Amino acid sequence: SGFRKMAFPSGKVEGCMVQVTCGTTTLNGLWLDDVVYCPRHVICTSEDMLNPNYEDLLIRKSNHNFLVQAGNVQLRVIGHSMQNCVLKLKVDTANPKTPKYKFVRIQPGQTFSVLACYNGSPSGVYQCAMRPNFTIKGSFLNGSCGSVGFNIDYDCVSFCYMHHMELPTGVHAGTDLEGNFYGPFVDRQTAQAAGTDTTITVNVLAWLYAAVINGDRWFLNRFTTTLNDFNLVAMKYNYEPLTQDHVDILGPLSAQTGIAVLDMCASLKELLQNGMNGRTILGSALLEDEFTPFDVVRQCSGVTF
Amino acid sequence: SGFRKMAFPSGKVEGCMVQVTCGTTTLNGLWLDDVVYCPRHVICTSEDMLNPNYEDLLIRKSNHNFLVQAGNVQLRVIGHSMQNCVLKLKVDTANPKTPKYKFVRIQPGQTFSVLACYNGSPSGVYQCAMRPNFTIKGSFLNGSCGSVGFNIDYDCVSFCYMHHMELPTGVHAGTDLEGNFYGPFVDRQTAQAAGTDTTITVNVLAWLYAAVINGDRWFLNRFTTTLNDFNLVAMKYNYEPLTQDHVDILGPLSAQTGIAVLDMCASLKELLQNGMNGRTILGSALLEDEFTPFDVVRQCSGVTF
Ligand SMILES: O=C1N[C@@H](CC2CCCCC2)C(=O)N1c1cncc(F)c1
Ligand SMILES: O=C1N[C@@H](CC2CCCCC2)C(=O)N1c1cncc(F)c1
Question: What CATH number does the domain located at A201-301 have?
Answer without folding.
Answer: 1.10.1840.10
